[PDB]
């Protein structure tokens, strides 16, 4: 198991990715552009309510 040089090579590039992930490394503008795109899509699909605490209802009796 200590022999599959590709195995340990992938694990090593993994460890490097782990340490370097202070901010999404090699993100490029596509990272932010996408993140924004699907965040906006999800926000639109879900709702526009006070996305922080519980909005209040204040119903009306019959």
């Amino acid at each position: 198991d200590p022999v599959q040089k590709l195995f340990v090579d992938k694990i090593r590039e993994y460890r490097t990715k782990r340490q370097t992930s202070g901010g999404p490394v090699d993100a490029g503008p596509e990272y932010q552009q996408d993140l924004d795109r699907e965040l906006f899509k999800l926000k639109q699909m879900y709702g526009k309510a006070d996305m922080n605490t519980f909005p209040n209802f204040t119903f009306e009796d019959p």
Partner: protein, 54 residues
């Protein structure tokens, strides 16, 4: 005599209209309560789902 006696025996039970109204208004109150509970549950679930899905 029979007409009058049966008329009285019948108008004795005119209370069904009010009994209706009673249970109908109780039903209206119950449906309002159910809608309130389900609306609050739906809103909380919607916010939780928003967070989880993002």
């Amino acid at each position: 005599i029979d007409m009058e006696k049966s008329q009285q025996a019948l108008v004795q039970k005119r209370h069904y209209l009010f009994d209706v109204q009673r249970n109908n208004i109780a039903m209206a109150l119950e449906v309002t309560y159910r809608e309130r509970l389900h609306r609050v549950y739906r809103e909380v679930k919607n916010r939780l789902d928003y967070h989880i899905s993002v």
